Amino acid sequence: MGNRGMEDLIPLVNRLQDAFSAIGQNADLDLPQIAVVGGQSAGKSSVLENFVGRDFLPRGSGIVTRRPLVLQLVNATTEYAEFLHCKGKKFTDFEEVRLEIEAETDRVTGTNKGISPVPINLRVYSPHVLNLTLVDLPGMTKVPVGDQPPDIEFQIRDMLMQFVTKENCLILAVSPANSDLANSDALKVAKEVDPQGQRTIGVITKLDLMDEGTDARDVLENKLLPLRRGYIGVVNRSQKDIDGKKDITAALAAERKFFLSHPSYRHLADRMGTPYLQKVLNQQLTNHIRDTLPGLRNKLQSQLLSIEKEVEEYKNFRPDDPARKTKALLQMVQQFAVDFEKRIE
Amino acid sequence: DIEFQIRDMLMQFVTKENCLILAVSPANSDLANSDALKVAKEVDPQGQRTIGVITKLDLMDEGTDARDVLENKLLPLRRGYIGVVNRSQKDIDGKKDITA
C-alpha cells in the first residue's frame, strides 16, 4: 500500500485533529473529495486503484463502473471495508471487496449496462488512510445502450451538475487506454464544467498507444492544451493485461521505462507518472491543509481572546478572602442602588 | 458554440432529402461515446440512410475486437456495418500507395 507521504502526513494531522477534538469544537481541514470522470471504459477505477498502489476496483473494457461510489476512508487500527447497506461484515481481501461490490452493482442495476443514482457507500478503515471521501463515477455514455433509456446521458449530466460541481471536489479527467486520445469524454466534461482548471487534474494515457507517427509532447508540456494544473502522463493497461492481472510494481516500472525510452517523453519521464502524480496530489493536500490553517488559527485567536477576559475576572483569586466578598457586596449594593434609581428616574 | 455551429452546419446538410450519413469512428474510441450515432438516430431513428463504419482496426487495444460490433449485433442497424481500416500517420509519412 503506502505511501510514505500520506503516512508522514497522518501523524501531524492526527495530533492537530485530536487537539481540535479535545477543545470540543467541530473543526476539520475539509480535505478534498476525489471525483474521477470519463466515458465508457475510461479506466476511472483503474487509475484510482493504481494511484492507491493496489488493485481493488472493478475495471475493464466497455462499461464496468456503473454506480457512483462514496469511498469513505477512515483511519483505524486494522484495514478492512464495510457498507452502509451491507452492515455486519468486515473483509480483509480487497479483491473480494471488489467482487462483492460489483455483485451489488449488477444486482441493483441489472446486467444490461444499467446505472443507479444512489451511490454505494464503502467505509475502508485503515491505519494508512485519512478521513477522505472518494466519489467514483460510472462510465458515461452518450447514446442509450443496453437497458438505458434515450434520456440517459442528460441525466448523467444532471447527476454531474448536482454532485461533482460542488466546491473542493477534485475532478480527475482521465484519457484511458482503450478509447481514443482526443475523444476523451473525461477531458470533454472537465473542459465543459470547469474551464478554469482550479480543481481539475488532467491525467493522460496511451503515450504508448497513440497513432504511429505522432506524439503528445505539445499536449503534455501544457503547450497545445492550455491547462492551469497541467498534465501528468501515465499508462493504463489494455484489456489483455487487465484480464491477465498484471501486478502494480511491474506495470509502473514498464510504464516508467517506456517514458524513458520514448524520444518525445524522455524529458517528460520525470514530470509524468503515477508516483509523481501521487507526490503532487499529496503536496496539494499538504498545501490545502497548511494554507487553510491560518484562517482557523486567527479565528481561534479571536475566540480565545474572549476566554482570556474570563480568566482576568478569575485573575484575582484569593480563597477565601473577604476582599472578594466585600467587592461582591459593593457591586450588588451599587447595582441594586442604580436599579433603584432606574425605578424612580 | 463551435460544436453547436458545426452541428447546425451539418443539420443544414443532413436534413435535406437523400443525404446518406457515414457515422465513422475508429476502433480505438468507443462507438457509444460518439455523438455521430446520436445525431444520426435523431435525424433518422430507423437508420435507413445511415451507414456505420469502424476504422483503424490495426490500431486496436489489446484484449478487444470489433467481432461482436461489426456483425450488427451490439447495435441493431438495418444494413449493418461495413468495416475499413484507415492509415496511421506513418502511412502518409512513407507515402503508401493505393495498392499497398
Swiss-Prot record, chain B:
Chain spans, region G5 motif: 85-88
Highest taxon, organism lineage: Eukaryota
Stretch list, region G4 motif: 55-58
Binding residues annotated for GDP, in chain numbering: 56, 58, 61, 86-87, 89
Location in or out of the cell: Cell membrane; Membrane, Clathrin-coated pit; Cytoplasmic vesicle; Presynapse
PTM: Phosphorylated by CDK5 leading to synaptic vesicle endocytosis (SVE) activation.
Related illness: Developmental and epileptic encephalopathy 31A: An autosomal dominant epileptic encephalopathy, a heterogeneous group of severe early-onset epilepsies characterized by refractory seizures, neurodevelopmental impairment, and poor prognosis. Development is normal prior to seizure onset, after which cognitive and motor delays become apparent. Developmental and epileptic encephalopathy 31B: A form of epileptic encephalopathy, a heterogeneous group of severe early-onset epilepsies characterized by refractory seizures, neurodevelopmental impairment, and poor prognosis. Development is normal prior to seizure onset, after which cognitive and motor delays become apparent. DEE31B is an autosomal recessive form with onset in the first months of life.
Family from the record: Belongs to the TRAFAC class dynamin-like GTPase superfamily. Dynamin/Fzo/YdjA family.
Domains as described in the record: The dynamin-type G mediates homodimerization and plays a role in self-assembly. The C-terminal proline-rich domain (PRD) mediates interaction with SH3-binding partners. Is required for DNM1 self-assembly.
Its biological purpose: Catalyzes the hydrolysis of GTP and utilizes this energy to mediate vesicle scission and participates in many forms of endocytosis, such as clathrin-mediated endocytosis or synaptic vesicle endocytosis as well as rapid endocytosis (RE). Associates to the membrane, through lipid binding, and self-assembles into rings and stacks of interconnected rings through oligomerization to form a helical polymer around the vesicle membrane leading to constriction of invaginated coated pits around their necks.
Quaternary structure, from the entry: Homodimer; homodimerization is mediated by the dynamin-type G domain which promotes assembly-stimulated GTPase activity. Homo-tetramer formed from two dimers in the absence of lipid. Oligomerizes into a helical polymer that self-assembles around the vesicle membrane, when associated to the menbrane through lipid binding.
Protein name (record): Dynamin-1
Species this protein is from: Homo sapiens (Human)
Portion of the full sequence shown: 151 to 250 of 864
